[PDB]
């Protein structure tokens, strides 16, 4: 539970170490079930007010279904196509004829049991509604009758509480075409959800992970609409499978690094690109690009390998040796010298230029460092805010090693008569080439 | 109801055609209309906690109001001034003294009543929630005592429900500044909507196609708050007018192309832009290069004109002949051989490069074919899924006949040594200028 | 109150001008209290559906305590983290042993009550929710029994509102990991809030404000999750303090600039970058490139400074002299010319280029405006919707006076054939610079 940063005072480039990796892989699929009571509109005497508030709400169950029953018919497409194939095999088989009854007939005496589709893939289905159980058993030996009968409170707001859950899943279904990401605590129950992580063929290493960050699992999963058919409302729930664990992680930051020349529109720039989150798989290593796609608990980075490009292993060089022959490290170029700061880990790269104050302060004492012109490197050990210009951040203070790696920036090794300023995704292999075939037809003329 | 996709081995992309547009080209506007109770609070010698429950949902009611009046007077901006000025001029129409009288008295009857502004134009006017009336008929009787008097039960809580939805209302028009979409459901319930589509004046094929897309119509809409006066709540809702209809619209998919020279730094890239669908629109092609701005309900693709560019019908030009002399194609190079998959309507593109396992399996047959350098493009028919690196894609299962265009990949015909390999934004053609430009340069020396 | 605008035909750029700023440079913090229930599951005889229904509502409950307990030993990581070390400076206080009795005891008498932390950082506490005091009281005498006693169903309701806070409290900062922004009104009741708001060391004047733009506060506030300990749920509410007040702000808007020439391919464009606002701050100017980081009341921007770049004063330059020597004024060039229009504050730019219908209508007298091939201004008045294309955009109604600053289009300036026609990032000065050194490898040949 280590950390580790190292700057490279060359690059104007950070990197953050020591942590583990939660890569999905696979995906672990489940059946939820609502048992639903098929009723069709009935009129009886009812003038009872109590009467008329099951009206409400067993109209408001009636439209739940058909409007469930109409997203199904329209062939809504999503973005996460790419992502669901195994749940949505899962809801292809449950169409066909037989299978729905094997489920329906298989969850009689339980709330979960174990069914084979026949395939037989199987998988572990859920009752987690049970609305035709309670209108049957409360609720329709009442209205069974030539004038509705005076049921009673109680029942009423038990059946409110439980068809609430029902239109708020319907409505998430609704807006997001039967797929939605995150699931919500109305599709599974924090209770369920840890019930189906006990029950999964994982080690009990594996459900301690999933069962310490169910947020996160949440956040990774996928839930899938079926079908409404023979008093049966099941949907799928795709978890994720974290096939690569406790590999080392570490997320890249970079700033701008330019020249300090006084004149105006003198100064050359270059950053680094590719920051983001850095992960060994497979013998490869996989980038994360996005913000956001990956997730942190303690020391621990939790991303969709869906979301990845893959790299060689030789990435990493360009973190201690940028100009080697192996890899293409790569940067951009410019010269645009706003300065920012980037909050690392455990510190803050910032890259100041021109007249801006850039400073570092600790709340009890001031300011206790001020950047010169140029990229630096401040730990957040007795640091608790950073200043660039008028823009103040807040010092991360997690606790670990920081280690300054000094050097010469790299930037001073570039003239700025022949240097392509304006290159948005360039290797240094490209700028190098590129500046060794523009100096030679100087050197003929 | 016929996909097809055609992939251009030449270009590294893929068209999928076949679907019909509808596209909105105008907005039809209704008033939403809650009838609400002008009540000052009133303290009488009350402990009954039935009493007490409604002193709790009467105190929310006046908070919401007010929440409500206040929104207005405080003059919000959204982004989505562009979008609403025929509903904004409703809101407007609804200030002027006259106005509100003319709607509340026509309501007074009935649940749903067009409506003349006087300009005059006409909208149709909906009372959804009718709280005057409740609070009048069962509340203030009880309440208008020397000593409150005792109401019952199953009136709290048809109270609740009723105020729960205006509650939910203003709270989305709050933090939304009184302009949300989509329109959500307690805005207007599925049922209003399927109301308020009957009720246009469009034809029943339109009539059908908006009542069978209920959920991207919704995500179409704006809602827009006007005037709380004289005991009225009034909500402009604008809904989308679909005037290109049945048009062909087709997807653009690109992958990067790249020589595959097994020397470092020696590969040139180039991948063209504009990714993203095109409809036939008025003579013109209507794109739209944002991702989700567009929505597909089977083999029809539902898009607001208002995120697209409009381009001659010669862009479809660079799909079978990108030199040509009447359109400028338009690509992006560069040296960043990454290898990637775009999975498409009927298959996938993959783009292999490097030491990179680019594979497409069946999942019953295992691997079924191997990628070489290059880019590439498989059928979905007989595979599952695609994989590049430790990255692994579903392949849409949609039918639909793929062909594939064999042709020289045109990457191949540029020289390295004067491409110009950093072009974010280039035609086929400046690049071609330039390699001409800069070739004699070469010459002369 | 007066808006002002001009339109630069020489650059294709405008400037709205005539706001006022409103810039989040510091935070308050507050402790926000619920009165827990310490409950260890008891079972007794109990059949009484009503006696069920609280059984029900108490497992709810504990597990929403057991749920957030859980969220805190697990230590979700935030993008929110340089944005809330002073809140979170305040929970990590609150997690010393003698430090939530200080609260408690300080909390008994009243809901509102300023504390001492002993820092002593004094902050303003609040208890917004009592359950502990609720179930106390009415509930756990009757269910202190060796048999259930039958509780009364008003008492049901009563604490099932209560308790529909808590779940939807403890739902939002599970999965935003105990760090929500904006904060919603389950966190903090608008009364609460505007309560909140009155009782700071703030002028009347700022007061007003803030009471005024209640939902842009809300919009720029952070909910931070501190602790459940002794019988006590407390979260930090960071508030926004805007020590930029009253200073000019302005906003820039720009559209692609093109030759007009006739033949295919023959047209260089270039546009100005860093569009977005810009406000006067401490002698400099923050600028906020992002898209809805700042927020407009009336008049007034509301912004947080941690979005922005901090520019020497001289970037106005960029709008009146744009070849000037003091700043590097930014463009962007290429040869792309597609039609375009960009909505200002009170007119429209537009720029047409090619064989696209450019045009400006009013509702009532139809077009009153056609523009020609290159880029132009509309004012707002007596004008309803813009025109390009197939795309239709409605004009900003707001009142204020337009001024056309006439020009030559500097893109008329440049040799076609020397010009750097794909620079994503540009000083006009790296183009110039750029120009005169490639027209010198002319002059020698």
Redesign the interface.
């Known amino acids: 539970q280590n950390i580790t940063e190292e700057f490279y005072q060359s690059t104007c480039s950070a990197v953050s170490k020591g942590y583990l990796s939660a890569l999905r892989?696979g995906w672990y699929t489940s059946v939820i079930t609502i048992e639903l009571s098929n009723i069709k509109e009935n009129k009886c005497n009812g003038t009872d007010?109590?009467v008329?508030?099951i009206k409400?709400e067993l109209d408001k169950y009636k439209?739940a279904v058909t409007?469930l029953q109409?997203?199904m018919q329209?062939?809504?497409?999503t973005?996460s196509?790419?992502?669901?194939?195994?749940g949505?095999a899962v809801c292809k088989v449950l169409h066909l004829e037989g299978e729905v009854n094997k489920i329906k007939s298989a969850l009689l005496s339980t709330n979960k049991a174990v069914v084979s589709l026949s395939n037989g893939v199987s998988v572990l289905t859920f009752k987690v509604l049970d609305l035709k159980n309670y209108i049957d058993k409360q609720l329709l030996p009442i209205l069974n009758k030539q004038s509705c009968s005076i049921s009673?409170?109680?029942?009423?707001?038990?059946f409110?509480?439980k068809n609430n859950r029902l239109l708020e899943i319907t409505?998430e279904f609704?807006?997001n075409?039967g797929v939605t990401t995150?699931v919500s605590?109305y599709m599974l129950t924090?209770?369920e959800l840890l019930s189906l992580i006990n029950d999964m063929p994982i080690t009990n290493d594996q459900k301690k992970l999933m069962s310490?960050?169910?947020?996160i699992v949440?956040?990774q999963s996928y839930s899938i609409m079926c079908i409404i058919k023979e008093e049966v409302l099941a949907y799928v729930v795709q978890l994720p499978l974290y096939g690569v664990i406790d590999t080392p992680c570490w997320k890249l930051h970079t700033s701008p690094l330019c020249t300090t020349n006084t004149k105006?529109?003198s100064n050359i720039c270059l950053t680094r690109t590719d920051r983001g989150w850095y992960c060994d798989?497979?013998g490869?290593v996989?980038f994360f690009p996005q913000?956001?796609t990956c997730?942190?608990?303690?020391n621990r980075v939790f991303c969709d390998?869906?979301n990845?490009?893959?790299?060689?292993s030789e990435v990493n060089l360009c973190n201690v040796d940028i100009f080697n022959?192996?890899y293409?490290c790569?940067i951009m170029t410019?010269?645009?010298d706003?300065?920012?700061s980037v909050?690392t880990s455990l510190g803050a790269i910032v890259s100041c230029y021109?007249?801006?104050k850039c400073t570092a302060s600790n709340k009890n004492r001031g300011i206790i460092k001020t950047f010169s012109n140029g990229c630096d490197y401040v730990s957040n050990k007795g640091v608790?805010?950073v200043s660039?210009?008028?823009?103040?951040?807040?010092?991360?203070?997690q606790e670990g090693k920081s280690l300054y790696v000094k050097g010469e920036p790299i930037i001073n090794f570039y003239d700025p008569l022949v240097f392509?300023?304006?290159?948005?995704?360039?290797?240094i292999?490209?700028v190098n080439?590129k500046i060794n075939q523009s100096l030679a037809?100087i050197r003929?003329?």
């Open positions: 892989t007010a109590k008329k508030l409400q439209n409007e109409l997203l329209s062939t809504p497409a973005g196509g790419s992502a669901i194939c195994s949505v009673n409170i109680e029942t009423v707001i038990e409110q509480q409505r609704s807006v075409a995150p605590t924090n209770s310490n960050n169910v947020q949440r956040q105006e529109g798989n497979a490869s996989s913000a956001e997730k942190v608990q303690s390998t869906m990845s490009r893959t790299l060689p022959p192996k293409d790569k410019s010269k645009t706003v300065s920012s909050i021109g007249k801006t608790d805010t660039v210009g008028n823009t103040l951040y807040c010092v991360n203070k392509p300023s304006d290159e948005f995704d360039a290797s292999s490209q080439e037809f003929k003329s």
